[PDB]
Amino acid sequence: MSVEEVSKKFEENVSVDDTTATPKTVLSDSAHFDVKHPLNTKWTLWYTKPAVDKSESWSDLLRPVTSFQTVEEFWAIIQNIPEPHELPLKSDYHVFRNDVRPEWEDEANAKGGKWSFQLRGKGADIDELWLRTLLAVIGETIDEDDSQINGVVLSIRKGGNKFALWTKSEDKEPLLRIGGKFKQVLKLTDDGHLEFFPHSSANGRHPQPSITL
Ligand SMILES: C[n+]1cn([C@@H]2O[C@H](COP(=O)(O)OP(=O)(O)O)[C@@H](O)[C@H]2O)c2nc(N)[nH]c(=O)c21
Known part of the structure; x- marks a missing residue:
């Protein structure tokens, strides 16, 4: 019966x-202190290889997989080093979960924005350094980025690599500042090329985004 x-x-x-609840806690446990593989956040790994969506479906290509709180897995997608000009370009990797993570179609809905960076000059080893910065930004106890942002993304194209940073709401202020730096990490210079667009782009770009080098 029901008795209380x-x-x-x-x-x-x-x-x-x-x-004052020192001796009275609900869970006195705090391992943390990892930085050896497991960080402290959850992030799924959705990468797109083909692009037949023309007749198939952008969702029929994108393969959602690895969803952990470490770096070994993410490093795996990099282990293939196909991003540093090693794959059939037109690539598109996506990993996130902090505040949103539905997809470029709603990851912006997260209430942040989509910072992109179109690179032209070939370095053969740029997607490895820019990634260590994105995969690490998810958590890697880096702070000052893994909390204000929501998710990141990467995408290559015909002689035109393109990465994507999805903020959670930090505000374009800190973005025009971060994008600026993230723009150089690509090791570019031809024209600081890059793209700044708020979720308003993946859901009706009525107003103005931010900029496009
Ligand atoms: C990340 N993403 C990409 N697409 C579509 O995929 C197309 C990609 O075309 P693109 O802009 O040349 O990039 P890519 O070929 O390197 O991928 C675009 O027209 C997008 O509309 C997407 N379409 C949907 N619905 N959702 C997504 O998250 C998404």
Whole structure:
């Protein structure tokens, strides 16, 4: 049947009196201190190889997979080093979960924006350094980025690599600042080429995005 005592314990007023609940905790556990593979966030791994969506479906190509809180897995997609000008270009990798993670169609819905960077000059080893910065930004206890952002993405094209950074809402202010740096990490210079667009682009780009080098 349904039976419940009648005592109730309402006596935990500690708004500004420090957490006196020292000996009384719900879970005194905090491993953390990893940085050896497992970071501290959840991020799925959806990468797109083909592009037959023309007749198939952008969702029929994109392969959603590896969803962990470490770096070994993400490093795996890089282990193939197909991004640094090693694959059939037109590539598109995506990993995230912090605040959103539905897809470029809603990852912007996350309430952040989509920073892209179209590279032309070939370096043969640029997608490895820019990735270590994206895959690490997810968490890697880096702070100052794995919390204000929501997810990242990567995509190559005919002689035109293109990466994507999906913020969670940090505001374009800190983006025009980050994008600027992330724009150089690509090791470019021909014209600081790059693209700045808020979710408003993946859902009705009525207003203006940000810029496009
Ligand atoms: C990431 N993403 C890409 N596409 C489509 O895939 C096409 C890619 O064409 P593109 O802009 O030349 O990039 P790519 O060929 O290197 O991928 C675009 O026209 C997009 O509309 C997508 N379409 C949907 N619905 N959702 C997504 O998340 C998504």
